[PDB]
Amino acid sequence: TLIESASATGDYYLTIVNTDTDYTNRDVINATALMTGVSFVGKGTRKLAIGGSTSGEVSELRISNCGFISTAGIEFLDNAYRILFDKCALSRSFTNSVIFNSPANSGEVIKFNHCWMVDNGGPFTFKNGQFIFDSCSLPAGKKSGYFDPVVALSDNATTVFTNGNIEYQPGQSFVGFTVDGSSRLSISDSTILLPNDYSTVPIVNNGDGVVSLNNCSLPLYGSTTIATGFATRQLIGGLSKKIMSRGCYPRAGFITSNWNLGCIVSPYINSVSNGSGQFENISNWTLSQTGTDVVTVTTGNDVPNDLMFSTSFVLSVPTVGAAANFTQTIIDCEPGRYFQLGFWAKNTTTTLASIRFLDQQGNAVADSIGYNIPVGNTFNFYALVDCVPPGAYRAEINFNVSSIVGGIAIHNVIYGLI
Amino acid sequence: GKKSGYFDPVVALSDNATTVFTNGNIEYQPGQSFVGFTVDGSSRLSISDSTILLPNDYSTVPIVNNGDGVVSLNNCSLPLYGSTTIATGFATRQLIGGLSKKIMSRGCYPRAGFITSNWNLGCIVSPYINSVSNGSGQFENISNWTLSQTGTDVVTVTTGNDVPNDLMFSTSFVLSVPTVGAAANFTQTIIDCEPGRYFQLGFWAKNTTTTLASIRFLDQQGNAVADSIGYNIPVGNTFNFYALVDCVPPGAYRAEINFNVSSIVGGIAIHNVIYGLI
Numbered sequence: 001t002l003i004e005s006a007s008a009t010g011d012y013y014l015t016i017v018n019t020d021t022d023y024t025n026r027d028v029i030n031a032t033a034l035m036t037g038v039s040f041v042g043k044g045t046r047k048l049a050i051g052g053s054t055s056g057e058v059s060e061l062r063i064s065n066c067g068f069i070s071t072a073g074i075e076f077l078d079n080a081y082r083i084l085f086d087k088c089a090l091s092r093s094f095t096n097s098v099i100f101n102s103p104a105n106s107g108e109v110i111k112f113n114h115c116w117m118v119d120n121g122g123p124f125t126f127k128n129g130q131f132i133f134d135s136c137s138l139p140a141g142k143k144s145g146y147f148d149p150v151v152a153l154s155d156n157a158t159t160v161f162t163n164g165n166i167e168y169q170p171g172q173s174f175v176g177f178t179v180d181g182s183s184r185l186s187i188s189d190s191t192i193l194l195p196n197d198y199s200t201v202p203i204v205n206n207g208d209g210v211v212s213l214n215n216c217s218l219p220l221y222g223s224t225t226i227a228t229g230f231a232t233r234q235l236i237g238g239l240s241k242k243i244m245s246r247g248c249y250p251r252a253g254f255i256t257s258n259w260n261l262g263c264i265v266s267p268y269i270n271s272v273s274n275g276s277g278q279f280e281n282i283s284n285w286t287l288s289q290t291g292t293d294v295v296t297v298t299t300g301n302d303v304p305n306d307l308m309f310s311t312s313f314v315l316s317v318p319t320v321g322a323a324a325n326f327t328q329t330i331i332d333c334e335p336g337r338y339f340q341l342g343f344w345a346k347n348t349t350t351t352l353a354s355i356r357f358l359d360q361q362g363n364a365v366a367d368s369i370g371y372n373i374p375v376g377n378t379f380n381f382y383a384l385v386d387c388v389p390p391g392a393y394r395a396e397i398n399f400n401v402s403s404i405v406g407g408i409a410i411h412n413v414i415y416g417l418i
Numbered sequence: 419g420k421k422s423g424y425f426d427p428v429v430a431l432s433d434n435a436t437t438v439f440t441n442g443n444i445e446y447q448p449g450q451s452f453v454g455f456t457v458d459g460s461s462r463l464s465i466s467d468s469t470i471l472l473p474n475d476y477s478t479v480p481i482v483n484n485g486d487g488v489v490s491l492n493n494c495s496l497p498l499y500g501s502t503t504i505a506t507g508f509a510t511r512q513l514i515g516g517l518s519k520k521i522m523s524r525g526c527y528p529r530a531g532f533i534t535s536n537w538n539l540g541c542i543v544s545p546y547i548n549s550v551s552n553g554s555g556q557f558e559n560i561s562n563w564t565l566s567q568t569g570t571d572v573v574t575v576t577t578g579n580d581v582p583n584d585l586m587f588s589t590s591f592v593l594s595v596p597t598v599g600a601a602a603n604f605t606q607t608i609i610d611c612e613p614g615r616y617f618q619l620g621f622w623a624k625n626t627t628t629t630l631a632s633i634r635f636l637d638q639q640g641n642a643v644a645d646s647i648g649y650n651i652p653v654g655n656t657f658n659f660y661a662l663v664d665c666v667p668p669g670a671y672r673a674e675i676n677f678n679v680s681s682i683v684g685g686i687a688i689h690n691v692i693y694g695l696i
């Protein structure tokens with residue numbers, strides 16, 4: 001354990017260089033390059049530097065069984081790439097955690113293997129570069145009074161997060177990943193664990209950014225505060241529509257009668273069309289009367305927020321005898337795969353929302369799943385995450401209004417596979 | 419790169435070998451160009467969460483899939499924009515060569531985006547990721563296509579042998595504009611859309627009229643769910659490959675590939691139209 005003294009000055013406590021600038025010797029030297037078995041305990045003022053404009057290429061360096069605790073971060077300089085952090089701790093950092101400010105001749109396959117990265121007080125700045133997280137855990141929480149330890153991708157950076165855990169402790173709530181410019185984030189075979197009071201989103205996708213989720217355990221049931229102030233109760237924020245998810249599932253299941261506790265992956269995984277009345281008509285929907293009087297439908301400007309749409313459908317029940325079905329079907333079904341269904345609603349009549357799955361001949365292939373929307377004068381988000389049944393060809397979203405004189409505003413209807 | 423004067427350092431799978439390439443980088447230095455992976459027999463290659471980086475004058479393909487081989491790409495950064503020399507002499511400007519049609523790709527994307535007005539700089543993953551049918555006139559008719567007149571006189575369409583190469587099809591569509599007043603749309607729609615996932619669109623064209631090619635996405639009721647992406651095909655007397663790689667928009671149910679010809683007496687030969695998800 002190397003504890004930095006209080007009198008230590010400068011910006012760096014350790015700089016890793018290669019005074020051999022010769023090509024012939026590079027592979028010979030870098031094959032055996034090793035730093036192992038040291039815990040560095042800083043005082044939050046000095047960084048670790050890798051490379052340098054005057055250094056030879058620092059690559060294929062194994063940093064194994066090492067700790068970088070309470071430092072001012074790890075900074076990549078010129079000529080630093082393919083560094084292997086092999087089971088290391090990078091925790092309790094001050095001001096910065098990892099600095100990659102697009103240095104020259106740097107960034108190829110930088111891998112964190114089984115790394116413990118928690119309680120940091122500064123961002124992971126990935127301006128370009130290629131970063132791999134494998135069986136890592138982060139962020140747990142942030143250093144109180146400092147900056148969010150966000151993994152911030154910008155320019156043309158890529159980041160893989162696989163076989164790991166994205167978890168926040170109770171009382172911790174901040175964005176963990178941001179994707180900007182033409183950056184890309186891929187998360188696979190991992191768990192994302194959010195405490196009950198988590199009120200933002202773990203991932204924000206901006207610009208030309210891409211986010212892809214693959215066989216991940218997701219917190220899609222239980223919370224009514226996730227993504228407070230976003231377009232929907234969604235796991236991925238931002239306005240970039242380049243969102244992909246396959247094989248993801250609710251962590252420990254989903255109580256299908258409590259759509260009020262549901263969360264979707266993203267509002268852009270949506271094969272519904274005109275799901276918020278943005279066409280200023282009801283194209284892709286049919287309204288089938290079932291009572292004595294006529295239920296009416298219109299498109300209005302009463303919305304919970306205008307982050308995606310400024311319109312909503314409004315179904316009106318003028319008499320106790322009026323009743324109707326408001327229906328759209330979506331040809332987008334893969335049996336055995338989970339789907340997401342979501343919508344905002346403000347209901348003052350009796351509305352039964354349901355989904356069922358039909359085959360190519362229109363036969364229902366399984367029992368429908370219904371949910372009575374609570375009555376009230378506020379918008380609330382509802383979502384269902386469940387598995388597509390065998391034989392399904394098209395999903396059918398239906399709203400049945402009846403019984404009570406009033407109406408329901410329906411905003412941003414969403415259905416897609418995750 | 420390769421050792422100068424020696425053999426290609428190709429990763430050559432034969433018989434019943436398997437190979438996984440994950441979390442890594444497949445990159446060639448400037449001035450280096452050779453096939454990096456070959457798949458033969460009943461071998462299988464899977465590439466995941468990796469980058470494939472090709473220099474400016476790279477002129478072949480990094481992967482060749484032969485026989486009963488399988489190649490699968492998963493969430494990879496691909497060089498799909500910028501080069502007109504990739505896969506020189508192959509059936510299309512494609513990243514995977516060979517004749518094996520067992521090609522899969524999900525979650526792949528152009529490395530740093532795609533300037534959607536420059537289809538002349540586009541590259542596709544594979545011509546076998548194709549849900550277009552009769553995309554090259556191989557049926558000797560225009561099944562799955564519609565010709566709709568929009569001007570005076572009549573634009574005509576035939577299938578003929580005018581091709582850039584015979585590696586996949588020996589036929590092409592030929593649209594002919596007889597007068598300056600003639601105009602028509604030549605359209606196929608493909609029900610194969612996953613919102614949020616990238617698509618590939620590609621075709622060979624040799625154009626002496628005014629041809630606006632475009633793709634747009636329609637819902638199940640035929641409404642466009644986003645602005646169409648159009649590309650004016652350059653005029654000339656040579657075949658060139660054009661491609662667009664972009665993201666399927668929300669609400670998309672069917673992709674609509676359209677060629678609008680008008681204005682100039684002449685024609686356009688269209689060869690090996692390709693659309694699929696990657």
Ligand code: NA
Pocket residue numbers: 331609
């Ligand atoms: Na269909």
Ligand SMILES: [Zn+2]
Pocket residue numbers: 162440
């Ligand atoms: Zn893996």
